[PDB]
């Protein structure tokens, strides 16, 4: 699609929810930060990623970003 | 992996941030949210998405939920 890619939006926003360095990169430089994970976002999106306030985006965070870390570390097949 | 599977939980927590139904859908009964959009999650997955709070979900994801939603209505291909 043009302006939305919802999946691999979801993946990059998704991501940032999981990951507070992530979500900090993504915040200060969308477009590369997208690319660097194998996501192009449109003009569209960048600007819709940019609405994602980081102090916000933490307080929503801040419990499953600690459940996964300390899950994934150790994390077996 | 057993208990994290990072992409598909970014899928779903992902879709929870752009989507408020979804978000409600996935608080209220998060296996079943997550199997009605082809995810499994293990227990350790579920107890993590129940940790959360959809209000402070709604508060980070409001502006970018309107944003996306105006864009996707009439969206083409390229």
Known sequence: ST???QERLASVVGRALLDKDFAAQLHQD????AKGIGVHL???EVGAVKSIDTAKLTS????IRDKIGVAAIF???
Do not use: I, L, M, Y
């Not at 969308?30 to 930060?33: D, G, H, I, S, Y």
């Open 3 to 5: 302006k939305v890619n």
């Open 42 to 44: 449109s003009a569209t």
């Open 60 to 63: 929503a965070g801040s419990a």
């Open 30 to 33: 969308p477009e590369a930060a």
């Open 75 to 77: 994390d077996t097949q």
